[PDB]
Write a protein that binds this ligand. Sequence first.
Ligand SMILES: O=C(CO)[C@@H](O)[C@H](O)[C@H](O)CO
Ligand SMILES: O=C(CO)[C@@H](O)[C@H](O)[C@H](O)CO
Ligand SMILES: O=C(CO)[C@@H](O)[C@H](O)[C@H](O)CO
Ligand SMILES: O=C(CO)[C@@H](O)[C@H](O)[C@H](O)CO
Lengths: 322, 321, 319, 320
Amino acid sequence: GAIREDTPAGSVIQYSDYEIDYSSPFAGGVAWIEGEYLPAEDAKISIFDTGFGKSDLTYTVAHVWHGNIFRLGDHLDRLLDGARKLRLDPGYTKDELADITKKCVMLSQLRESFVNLTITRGYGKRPGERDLSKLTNQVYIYAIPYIWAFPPEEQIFGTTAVVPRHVRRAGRNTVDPTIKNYQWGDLTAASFEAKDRGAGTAILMDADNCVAEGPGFNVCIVKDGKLASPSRNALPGITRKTVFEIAGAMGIEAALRDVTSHELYDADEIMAVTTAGGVTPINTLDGVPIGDGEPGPVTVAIRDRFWALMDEPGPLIEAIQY
Amino acid sequence: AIREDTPAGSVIQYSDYEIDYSSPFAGGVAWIEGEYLPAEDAKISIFDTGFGKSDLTYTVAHVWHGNIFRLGDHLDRLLDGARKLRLDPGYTKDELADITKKCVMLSQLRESFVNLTITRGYGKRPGERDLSKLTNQVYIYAIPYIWAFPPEEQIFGTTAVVPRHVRRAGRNTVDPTIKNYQWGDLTAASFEAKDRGAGTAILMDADNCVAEGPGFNVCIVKDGKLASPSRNALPGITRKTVFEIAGAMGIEAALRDVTSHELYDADEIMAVTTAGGVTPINTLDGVPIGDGEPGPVTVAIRDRFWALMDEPGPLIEAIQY
Amino acid sequence: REDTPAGSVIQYSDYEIDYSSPFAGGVAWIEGEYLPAEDAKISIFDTGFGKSDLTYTVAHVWHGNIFRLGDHLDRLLDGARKLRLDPGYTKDELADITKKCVMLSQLRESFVNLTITRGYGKRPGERDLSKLTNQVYIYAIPYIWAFPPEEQIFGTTAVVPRHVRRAGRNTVDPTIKNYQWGDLTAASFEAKDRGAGTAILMDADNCVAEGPGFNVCIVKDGKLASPSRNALPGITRKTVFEIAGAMGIEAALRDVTSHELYDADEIMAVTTAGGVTPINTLDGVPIGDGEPGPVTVAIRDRFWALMDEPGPLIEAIQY
Amino acid sequence: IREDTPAGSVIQYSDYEIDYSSPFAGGVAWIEGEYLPAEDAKISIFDTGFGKSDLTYTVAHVWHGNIFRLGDHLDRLLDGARKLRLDPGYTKDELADITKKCVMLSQLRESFVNLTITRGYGKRPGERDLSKLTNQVYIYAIPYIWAFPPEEQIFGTTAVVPRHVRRAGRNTVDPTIKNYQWGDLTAASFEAKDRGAGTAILMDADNCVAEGPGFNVCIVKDGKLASPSRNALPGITRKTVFEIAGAMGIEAALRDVTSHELYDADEIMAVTTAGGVTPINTLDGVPIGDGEPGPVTVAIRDRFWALMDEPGPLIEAIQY
Ligand SMILES: O=C(CO)[C@@H](O)[C@H](O)[C@H](O)CO
Ligand SMILES: O=C(CO)[C@@H](O)[C@H](O)[C@H](O)CO
Ligand SMILES: O=C(CO)[C@@H](O)[C@H](O)[C@H](O)CO
Ligand SMILES: O=C(CO)[C@@H](O)[C@H](O)[C@H](O)CO
């Protein structure tokens, strides 16, 4: 399996130059399942894990770029906070999960990597146990080659979006988007609608015609040199957190607030932000260019800064010891 | 256990039989990636997007006294939803039926919970995102009978609350009209019902119409007529059976919007699901429905439902063990 | 009167009004008195104003015939019951006063409004509902078109709002006819801004609700459907379903999803104020061939014929 | 006119005599450019402010002869009118002059004051073109209206969350622009009355607190104040409450308040022009804290009433 793919020449996005030693069976991808390190290709879970049958779980995703894992501490904090709200117990400390995660990456030998930690309600002594008190919660962790929500070419030159005609985001009182979850029924439906409409992605609205988020990303808009991102029906994203910190360092006002359907359509810039590929300019909405139809200046400034962070020793990154 | 206690003399009784545990299939079978496995060995790829995106549909049938109930109706529903999700099981209705009946026959269970699941599946590499590159998977299993409500509550009734904090996901979000594993709202509602000391929750939709419950449809009776939600609810096969029973009894039955006012004013409320049948709901938010005991229409339909499992006819098929 | 298309099924009556009557052209009945429409005034302290605490119905008169007045009175009084309003008159008394307004107006084509408000007490600013006297206001004025005659015959255009949805049955309930048009007014402004004839609003689950002053019906594969939930139970819709049945056309009150609206073979607006309006395009996309559909035309032409045919649906005003 | 208030409480009507030889005594409306006695105030049945409730308004109170925050009221009224494409055809200063004259002619020292801007009517009844409708301004000053009785202001009221009704969302009948469209509020009030409660607190579509029938809701938890930011009127009483909270060193946030946070609150209060700050002792029959007015609610309520007598920029004495 490829550990690299093309990125625009000279751009802020470049994979590491290195060779993996495939004499190790862990080379290229690792999972940690029921306390054992496995080749990613061998990684299997009980079909009776209620994380399958009820999607009764939470998770987080972190990236590794140039051998640096990005904000793992913040990822573990959000994961464990969510698990606590779901009455889940990983049975491992934050530092224990940090060491297991870093070991997955190290065994993979991947310098660019998509890293998942999942906590499930789990399974009991026999299949089809339904008393939560009898289910042993499971931790599953994996590190695999880098995943792009949008290809490198779109990270640099922009993607396109539609607002679905047929779908809205599940609200915080249904399948709660503020706890990261695998329940993508609405997100999958929106993505199918964007693909059918020839667009790169979908931006979903909440029940009150406020911007929610997209399938695997938060949305930020810029209007009159100010940045806004949805406060209610949206994951509290760590990329969004990073974007707000960059904006403050640049003297750009950044508010978490309701962004109405009016404000989305009237935006000077629209961007997608996510762990899986960073900051994506959205050049077009429902076939209408935003600004001049190319990546906006705040979006370009913040994106370029984001990728620079992956090479600057400091609290946001930790070097994997390969 | 292949059995649990049921109220003595009640319409609910497990079969009296011995399983041969020399078979590694005894008590539980799964069919995964084209192979029959002991249930305890049944594992799937972590990279199946049926896990990472819950991108799948399923159905559940029951086996009672060695008889599988409305399997053809379950496969029709399963395959119709799969077509709506752009999934392809890569097996015919008849092929899935044979594989399903073989899982039960190998389990040796006369009372069984039978699941068929169709997932978007996995590509050649973990982290394939391109749907055209994902090979859809079928997983089938037959395990001991599962009760959405204990047998004691099937006969004596359960208690319900309407969540203060949760609503059922709408058909335009995580669509409840296609059976799915995305129980975020249903799990939250169950925890609230448990926190309040109730047997279960009845969730409303965005317009304060009844949706359904965690693993069941709701039916009400008012002035001798039955009604069940049409919009934000699974089209249940137990509900289908209940409407047929009602028809045969001369009782009008409508699939329609049931408002919050109508739920609270109901003469009777009942839960209906594959996993345990027809459950009387005695109280709603601590207020007795009728006299706070199983209603007369509910009892008549529940008892008729169980009688169907022993009557030769087109709704049942005997597993040939 | 105003222009209608030459030779079409819509034609005003040929007659002259005697303007020696101060009632000629418009009559209201307010606080037990018939008045010229030009003089019809209500107390500002009617809570029908300050809380929009009221229901109403609208009937039309065409060629001197009032259409389904009994059904209109039934619907008005049923909603007034749900609102705990009491008009303090019987159905037959209201029917007599209604026909008298039309007669005094001399209008052969007329828009007829019956409103029941929560009313006012002895003191402005009375808030105790038990101390408010409910009020009945009735008027008959020249015919009002939700769509012009030209659009009745040749069709209009619609958009689905980007920014607005219909209030649900559990908020400001559309199943009880009301003056609370905040959403409908926002949707109409959005359609105007977007160069469209009108708006079709969605409910919270992306099911068709209705439009600003009309129900929506679709045709798909020769079958008619109209929303069952977040929509007024229209008397034009009731008529359309009776016409469809008599034509051998299957007609269902059910949820119509956003998918089914956009995929429809035909779309129509139905309302008392102008009848059955073909909708040629939705968000700029032609419905069928972008001209009034065959079911829509058959039902619209039948609807206008019902106005002139003696029977239970019509009663001739005695002028 | 006055009614009983609790003896020695922070709420007391003025002691004074109206001269009823003026026909304006006790109540005045300003309709179609004419000052009228309230009893004679009538509007065209064809104003689309009636038939479409196509209007906005605001309500100010007069207490001890002082009108409270009229400029804020006028700013909020006119901002909402611009959003509705309404034009009063009067300046903020002209509307202020007309408002204060209604109060002066009424002789009321305690008054409920309404300013309404409607889409209006055309030359013909039933005119269908908005561009041909002349927008109307209607203003009145009448005796003080209480959302909750003085006894409840001092000793607290009770509330329920409706089983059957929710607040209309900002994308339907928008609660962020003051309106007469009370269909949900009226239904909620009927359900509270059926359940024997003082009032209803409505939720939005996501089970966040919206507001009540004529008031904003504020909660206190762990000594901090919160009030809904989305589906709720931007109240001037709420604005005052937040200024009073800041002055007292009490953290106050406009934010989503979940249904969890409402039921878990240490204090709940109703805030509105028509009676001020009302303690809510009980929710769905369960005591909030000890089932008596909470300490933050009492300190803010008493401060709010003291404001009506302190010379300062929030009040203007009516020159009778
Ligand atoms: O592209 C995606 C979806 O795959 C990213 O948003 C990321 O993967 C998410 O964290 C989990 O899938
Ligand atoms: O997981 C379950 C069992 O709890 C459900 O999928 C199943 O449908 C059952 O019919 C209701 O419990
Ligand atoms: O039938 C009606 C009654 O309201 C509406 O269609 C009418 O057109 C509206 O009152 C004016 O637009
Ligand atoms: O300001 C208010 C809110 O109280 C008034 O709009 C209302 O008419 C009356 O108080 C409600 O009963």
